[PDB]
Design a binder for this molecule. Structure first.
Ligand SMILES: NC(=O)C1=CN([C@@H]2O[C@H](COP(=O)(O)OP(=O)(O)OC[C@H]3O[C@@H](n4cnc5c(N)ncnc54)[C@H](OP(=O)(O)O)[C@@H]3O)[C@@H](O)[C@H]2O)C=CC1
Ligand SMILES: COc1cc(-c2c(C)cccc2C)cc([C@@H](C)C#Cc2c(C)nc(N)nc2N)c1
Length: 225
């Protein structure tokens, strides 16, 4: 009953997302987007959750974690529970799946989570294709004289485009209502793929804010008592 939204910055056409434990670029504009979307709420009395695997958590600079003004969840199999406060702004979980069910209980959450953002990394994302309702994917492309950075971690585009369709026509309406975006929506061919979303350029790169949504599903079974 609260939306689960995967959120990621990926380099086309392989959807590379990391190299040696870090992000393969540093794009202040893309960071600001991620910051604002995961922070901001339509309802001022709620926060969002950001869920991340242990290795992602360890890569965030120390002064910047836990990410402010959001409920942070870190998942490690060597942690104790489903969902345990360990510090102000910090929960530990030994289970991606059980922590989401725990987060969804209106009794625990008092209907004061707006959305649950899954913020990485590779392993966490692999596991989120059948959990997320939507994906917010920043599609990044090096400009013509930009060197393609090396990378070692990938979003599963196959499984992506299996389960979700490109709903970037609704991206603007989907974002919290006070975010402001520099570009208008824009369909552009790039190395044999349709790239649709909201353009920016920074450093050696062009990127598009896009939204993917779950495809429609046939009615095979509903559970009856
Ligand atoms: N471009 C982007 O938007 C983003 C990219 N990244 C990139 O991703 C890379 C990191 O990804 P990756 O190395 O795969 O690591 P993750 O951040 O996905 O962490 C993986 C760790 O998470 C824990 N974990 C995984 N599944 C579960 C589960 N079901 N339940 C409980 N714990 C679980 C385990 O911790 P343990 O070993 O402790 O048991 C595991 O080793 C880096 O390069 C980083 O820069 C990260 C965020 C965003
Ligand atoms: C790997 O090490 C990281 C460092 C930071 C980080 C840095 C480098 C500087 C200041 C503050 C922070 C939090 C953040 C992240 C993660 C949580 C991410 C992400 C993300 C981004 C950036 N964009 C889109 N679209 N989706 C995302 N999940 C990882």
């Amino acid at each position: 009953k609260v939306p689960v939204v995967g959120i990621v910055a990926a380099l086309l056409p392989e959807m590379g997302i990391g190299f040696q434990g870090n992000l393969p670029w540093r794009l202040a504009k893309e960071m600001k987007y991620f910051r604002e979307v995961t922070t901001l709420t339509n309802d001022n009395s709620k926060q969002n959750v950001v869920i991340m695997g242990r290795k992602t958590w360890e890569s965030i600079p120390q002064k910047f974690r836990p990410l402010p003004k959001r409920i942070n969840v870190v998942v490690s199999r060597s942690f104790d529970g489903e969902l345990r406060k360990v510090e102000d702004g910090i929960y530990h979980s030994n289970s991606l799946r059980n922590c989401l069910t725990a987060l969804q209980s209106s009794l625990a959450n008092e209907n004061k989570i707006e959305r649950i953002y899954i913020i990485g990394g590779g392993e966490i994302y692999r596991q989120s294709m059948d959990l997320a309702d939507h994906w917010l994917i920043t599609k990044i492309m090096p400009l013509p004289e930009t060197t393609i950075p090396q990378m070692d971690t990938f979003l599963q585009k196959q499984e992506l485009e299996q389960r979700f369709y490109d709903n970037s026509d609704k991206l603007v309406d989907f974002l919290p209502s006070s975010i402001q975006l520099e570009g208008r929506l824009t369909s552009q061919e790039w190395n044999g793929e349709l790239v649709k979303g909201l353009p920016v350029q920074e450093k050696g790169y062009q990127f598009y804010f896009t939204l993917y949504t779950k495809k429609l599903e046939h009615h095979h079974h509903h559970h009856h008592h």
